[PDB]
Amino acid sequence: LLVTKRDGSTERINLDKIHRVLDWAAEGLHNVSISQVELRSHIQFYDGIKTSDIHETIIKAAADLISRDAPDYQYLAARLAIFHLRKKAYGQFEPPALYDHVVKMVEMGKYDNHLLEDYTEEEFKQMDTFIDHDRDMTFSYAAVKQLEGKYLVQNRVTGEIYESAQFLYILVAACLFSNYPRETRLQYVKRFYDAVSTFKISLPTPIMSGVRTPTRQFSSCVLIECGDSLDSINATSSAIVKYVSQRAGIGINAGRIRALGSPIRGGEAFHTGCIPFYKHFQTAVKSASQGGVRGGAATLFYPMWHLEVESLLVLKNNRGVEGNRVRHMDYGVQINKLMYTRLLKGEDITLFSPSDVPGLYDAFFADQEEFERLYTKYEKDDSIRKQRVKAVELFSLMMQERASTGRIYIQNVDHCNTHSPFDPAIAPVRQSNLCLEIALPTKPLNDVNDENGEIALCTLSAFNLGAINNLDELEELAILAVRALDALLDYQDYPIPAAKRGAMGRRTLGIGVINFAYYLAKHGKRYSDGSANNLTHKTFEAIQYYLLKASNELAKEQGACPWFNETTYAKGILPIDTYKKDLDTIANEPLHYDWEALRESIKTHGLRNSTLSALMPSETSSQISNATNGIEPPRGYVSIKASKDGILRQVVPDYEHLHDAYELLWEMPGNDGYLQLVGIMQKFIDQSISANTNYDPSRFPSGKVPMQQLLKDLLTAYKFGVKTLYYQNTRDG
Template sequence: MNLIKRDGSKQPFDLEKLERILFYAVGDLKGVSVKLMTKIIETNVYDGMPTSELHKIATQAASELIGVEEGQHPNYSLVAGRLEIARARKEAYGTYTYPNLAQHTRHLIEEGIYDKELLEPFTDAQLEELNDHIRPERDDLFHFAGSMQMTTKYLIKNRVTDRIYDAPQHAAMLIGMAVLPTHYSGDELIREVKDFYDVVTTFEGSLPTPIWGGVRTPLRQFSSCVVVEAGDSLAEINAACDVASLYGAARAGLGGNLGMIRAEGSAVRGGLAYHTGVVPFGKKFEASVKACSQGGIRGASANMMWPLWHLEYENLVVLKNNKGLELNRVRRMDHTIQLNGYLWARLQEGEDITLFSPHEVPGMYTSFFADTAKWIELYEAAEKDPTIRKKTLSAVDVFTALFIERGETSRVYIMNVDHCNTHSSFITEIAPIRMTNLCVEITLPTKPMQTVDDPNGEVSLCTLAGINMGRVGPAQLRRVAHVLVKFLDALLDYQDYMVPAARNATMKYRPLGIGVTNLANYLAKNGVKYSDGSANNLVHEYMEAFQFYLIEASMELAKKFGAAPGFHCTKYSRGQMPIHHYKKAVDELHSAELKLDWEWLASQVVEHGMRNGTLSAQMPCESSSQVSNSTNGIEPPRELVSVKGNADFTITQIVPDYFELKDAYETLWEMPNNRGYLALCGIMQKFFDQSLSTNTNYNPSLYEDGMVPMQEMVADALFFYRIGGKTLYYSNFRDGQGDEEKAEALLAATSMSQAKEEEPIDSNMGCDSGACSL
């Protein structure tokens, strides 16, 4: 049989050459067989097969053997990963070895693929020094899932022809080379680039899709998260939709706050017309987002915000639902319902909740976020005012609708707006938090715009990265935290901004969002579990150091480059660290003492300032965790061996250190309930200055008749509120259930008796306990 080479010529199929490639991929790995892979490949080879397809079949042959059953082995994941990355190198460079970095980069600059300024900050000697620092052997660390993430999303490629232009080690080095000259030069620049390269290529730190897939190209938009707020006027709504369209096309996930829009039937132009309500504008925002495909890297997505007390609540809470007409649903977006402790207390006390159109009670919408006591005063006065349009429902009915939709769709989220402000980086009366983002971990100030060119609006961006807890223990944490803060801060000055409101807000606050990944592996290595409280002190110790070193790094940058212009808007400027304004109830869950010198850090921050208004946010890490073969973010693994796939390929992923730790891992569906996991999230939230993508998970098979009591879902959310939780993300049911099955498995409550057993929310609690006075 003949194979067709890339230049169109024929060559005989060479079994010995194939075996040499397979032996390279196997290396010194145990439990894998070249002979077995060769048999699988030979059955798929045909006369006239392109050599590029043979490479793909070799990767596929190894991937089919990933597993823990007889004839399988987890190490085939490394074999498949090495073969896939070798295929990328061959396609990008015409050879399996990396060419000279500067020469290849110049070639791609000439082709218009790389940024034309990429090499300008470096001398020839510096380029050779960086080329010599590249470690091709680190490609051997990629498992199959990570290699496929690289070749399908992260490496630069022609999205039409699928031609790959670079490989991971060049990509990682060039990302640092593109960004860090913004702040550094000379020997210091070379040192910073090397440090960044080492953190990324050893998987100590992880980068999100916009950075991997964009930095080194002419496109300069790398913020993962964009939060944009619509006002109540047509101009403000149109401006928010335009921004959503622009940033959706630029690979960002979007949060859209449409909660300020007045309710259906409201007077417009003094009563000459009446308002069509919120839903049409939700559909307009949806259309603006979904018109953009993000260049084939990932689909544009968004999350919309609505206050629970909005007069159209009954329409808004069902927008994700598959029932109803397309005309009155916004199904291709996710939705967040915004609450506070006062509304939770009304549920617990069996009272009513009154719904209003935001514009009809002046000051109520803004005070809902900025001044809870003022909001309560306005809210209760409006309830008694017969001239104000309103609708009164029992709190049980209001919350039942919320948790039915959250249970059935999994993607109706919760935002506790009071905690997002009291335990925020920002001083609430100066820069209130009114919304979150696609994955509900970002909490930054926003202001509506009149037009996309309005410089007085604020569109907040957050630029993300993660620290791999499985590879970075407490001893390495300070070094990795400093490297990532320096890189991301430089990225803010390197990237472009689609609209003035985004540039101005980013330059004012310079927000970062660094999280962690591979928590499940870290817990397994230390012999502790999510569900029984044994991990609580360990996580407290790690997260204290995590946030301490992030703040320290930002303070050191402020010494060198100056504090963020909006630093005075932060609690940090007053010497208030996260440990000074968290919800004290979380300390009931652990016995750990603070180990680091927070008073010293606070004094240094007051003296020198901070370069960044925020530093921490816990993102889901779905894609980036695959690159480093990590467990997903802070989540327990669903299975020790899991299979994911799409129309193009299927990936079998095995938890890290399977043979050593398989009995130490606790999987998601083994946990008896959510409380242990939520407790860990609460402990993390004690230190994080933004929020966490925190999920709840329910296995109907654990309940009588396979029915999940809604009271338990509500009780979980109340427990999370009590310990300071800011946001709740997905509500997952056991895999394999569609919406109808979820609905059947959810037992709707006619009372909230079980939820009421949670410790009541004190309606008189003051700011010293971590919440605004209620």
């Protein structure tokens, strides 16, 4: 059996060497058969097979045995993969010295040159002693696939990988704390590196692949508000094109655009509608996409009383004339208490065009008393153009469309402003983002470079709840997370004036969690019966407490954010003072942290960041740490994903011992349990949460989800202070 090498030279097969590596990789794993792997891969060998191909074959062999019954194959495959990547980058298993590596990469143009200016060779020597390359042996197969696929520095054309996981982690840390005083700089670098290398803190895909390289584009979320004017419509559109070329998710508020038929310039023109403009936003969003579908996503918001709401509600409906359909954008309907009350009483809802009702739109977000006043006034005013619809009809039309597409989202505007970090009089929250978890203030532009406009941006990350022993571990973790992301806000580039304005003014952050499901599993709690309410309350109090502590400490050191005076925090108001009171009936856990000490310290020294927390979905970050995604229950014990190399399988964390503890997604009898946990989480979260709603046809008579049930769950969510609602999953069975 002849073997061919990298230079294309022939050597004789050495089956004992292969076995050694397999043995190595298996160390410490349970229920994995080395022979099983050898049988399956040896049969595909042949005379003159390249060495790389042998590696791929054994890797896949291992990978194909991943299962619930033997989840440690995930690691057998992983380690084999890691081994192969080491040799692929360094030409041996052992990684080079940090300094040598960085020098080589800087010379090749793969790493930023500032790294060498910012740190001395002695400092790089010191950093090398922090690194633990044996941490590469703790990844799961799925995780290594992601790492190799979209994180590790590489040549996309030639397929060459230039680095390994541990250099990624150390250098990310290096970059983010490069402007720190020399007395504390490396202390912070080591602590952050440990956090992320031992999976305690999860960082977003953009940061993970970019920080350390020459780029400066790290923005993933941008919220744009569009005024009712051709200049603003053009500005918005221009802004989206710039941002989607750089991979940012976009949240667009286009609620002010006047309705179809409305007058233009007087009576010399009569509006064309919003649809046309919506279609213009869609092409802007998809402007940097392969073909015109792929990547670049956006969620467009509008009030429920808009005059064109019935046409807006069915924009993604897959059945209709092309000129009345904007299918490739998700929508977020904005509701408030008044609208829900009309439904409960079986009354009508009046539809108005924003241009015809002075003060109404603003009141909708910042003052519910004033909104009701104005709203009833204008209903009776006969000079105002309006339309009446039955609240049950509108809610069902909306819910039918949300049920069938899964992508018609809700946003409770009152909850977003009565319980938030911002003062609604000065900086109201009028929209959300792509995934409905960000909620930041925005101002319309009159031109792309308008400096008086405001585009919201948000930097994200997350805490791995399955990697901490006790909740007081979150103090260190919050320090590292806040400090690193605040440094990033000054590191990255801002293509549009208005976006820099918001980032430097308010320095807003969005830190959330991953691995919730696993966490609940190991504490013997479930989602559906209410058994996790108090633990969730305890857990989310810790997270918010320590995050505010971190941000507050940072403000002492480096000054609060410019526009800190527009926050409720500035007035001594806290998350615990404005939450939805109904919550008291479903959770009795006490506060365990000193919120009153903190209240005073915030008032006095302020916050570096106007917002700190936001619960977001995560697929890719969770994969790297073999964690359940965000706060959602797994759909099953094993995840299957498609790849060029083969089928990727990932087994939920500690399946061996917790299989009966988990509560799979379709096992829950309803949404109540989960909706209560979201409510409890929203007590303490600055922004919002990407809540889902899930329905299974086979649990209902005749396999049809009753509208009654859909409306009931909507109301429940409103009752416990839920700000937004993301996807609606319906089962395919």
